[PDB]
Amino acid sequence: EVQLVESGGGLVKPGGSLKLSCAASGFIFSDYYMYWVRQTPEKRLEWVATISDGNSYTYYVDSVKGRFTISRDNAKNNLYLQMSSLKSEDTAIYYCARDGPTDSSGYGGFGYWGQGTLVTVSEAKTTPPSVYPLAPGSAAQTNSMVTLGCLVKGYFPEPVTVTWNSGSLSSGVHTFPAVLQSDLYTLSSSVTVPSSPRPSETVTCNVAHPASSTKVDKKIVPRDC
Amino acid sequence: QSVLSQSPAILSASPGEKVTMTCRARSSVSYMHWYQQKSGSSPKPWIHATSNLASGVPARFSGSGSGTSYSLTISRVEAEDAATYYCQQWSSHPPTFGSGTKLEIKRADAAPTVSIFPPSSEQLTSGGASVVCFLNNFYPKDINVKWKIDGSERQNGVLNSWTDQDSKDSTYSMSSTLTLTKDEYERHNSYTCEATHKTSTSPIVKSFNRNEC
Amino acid sequence: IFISNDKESIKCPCEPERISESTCNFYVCNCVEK
Contacts of B18 (CB under 8 A, 6+ apart): B73, B74, B75, B76, B77
**Which residues of chain B have a CB within 8 Å of the CB of A187?**
161
CA A34 to CA A118: how far, in whole Å? 19
Closest CA to B195 of B183, B204, B207: B204
Mark yes or no for CB contact A105/C17 under 8 Å: yes
CA–CA min distance C11, chain A (Å): 8
- Look at strands A117-121 and A11-12 and give their pairing: parallel
Resolution of this structure in Å: 2.5
* DSSP conformation class of A199: T
Whether B62 contacts B73, CB under 8 Å: yes
Domain match, B213 and B121 both: yes
Whether A193 contacts A169, CB under 8 Å: yes
What is the domain range of residue C19? 1-34
A193 - beta bridge partners?
A: A146
Scanning chain B, the segments in alpha helix (DSSP H) are: 121-125, 182-186
On the CB side of A91, CA atoms within 13 Å amount to 15
Structurally, chain B folds into a number of domains equal to 2
Mark yes or no for CB contact B134/A190 under 8 Å: yes
Whether C1 contacts C10, CB under 8 Å: yes
Closest CA to B189 of B160, B152, B157, B134: B152
- Sign of the Cα torsion C5, C6, C12, C16 reads positive
Whether A18 contacts A67, CB under 8 Å: no
Domain match, B33 and B128 both: no
What is the domain range of residue B85? 2-107
CA A3 to CA A78: how far, in whole Å? 12
CA A32 to CA A100: how far, in whole Å? 10
Give chains near B: 3+ CB pairs under 8 A.
Answer: A, C
Closest CA to B49 of B59, B62, B60, B68: B62
Q: At B189, phi and psi to the nearest 5? A: -125, -60
Collapsed DSSP state (helix, strand, coil) of residue B183: helix
- Whether A103 contacts chain C with CB within 8 A: no
Closest CA to B4 of B31, B29, B23: B23
CA A100 to CA A123: how far, in whole Å? 39
CA B161 to CA B134: how far, in whole Å? 10
Mark yes or no for CB contact A110/B84 under 8 Å: no
What CATH number did the domain enclosing B136 receive? 2.60.40.10
**Which residues of chain A have a CB within 8 Å of the CB of C28?**
106
Mark yes or no for CB contact B93/C13 under 8 Å: yes
CA C15 to CA C18: how far, in whole Å? 9
Rg (CA), chain C: 9
Contacts of A168 (CB under 8 A, 6+ apart): none
- Whether A106 contacts chain C with CB within 8 A: yes
Structurally, chain C folds into a number of domains equal to 1
Where does residue B135 rank: exposed (0-12), middle (13-18), buried (19+ CB within 10 A)? buried
End-to-end CA gap in chain A: 54
* DSSP conformation class of B42: P
Residue ranges of domains in chain A, CATH in brackets: 1-123 (2.60.40.10), 124-222 (2.60.40.10)
Domain match, B118 and B172 both: yes
* DSSP conformation class of B37: E
Scanning A162-210, the segments in alpha helix (DSSP H) are: none
**Which residues of chain A have a CB within 8 Å of the CB of C8?**
52, 54-55, 57
- Whether C28 contacts chain B with CB within 8 A: no
Instruction: Show which of B44, B77, B107 is a domain's final residue.
Output: B107
- Look at strands B128-138 and B113-117 and give their pairing: antiparallel
Q: At B137, phi and psi to the nearest 5? A: 60, 50
Q: At A91, phi and psi to the nearest 5? A: -65, 125
CA A42 to CA A62: how far, in whole Å? 20
Domain match, B115 and B197 both: yes
Mark yes or no for CB contact A149/B134 under 8 Å: yes
Strands, sheet with A3-7, edge to edge from the N-terminal-most edge strand: A3-7, A18-25, A78-83, A69-73
Collapsed DSSP state (helix, strand, coil) of residue A88: helix
CA B52 to CA B62: how far, in whole Å? 8
**Which residues of chain C have a CB within 8 Å of the CB of A105?**
15, 17-18
What are the counts of helices (DSSP H) followed by strands (DSSP E) for chain C? 0, 3
Q: At A56, phi and psi to the nearest 5? A: -40, 110
Domain match, B117 and B177 both: yes
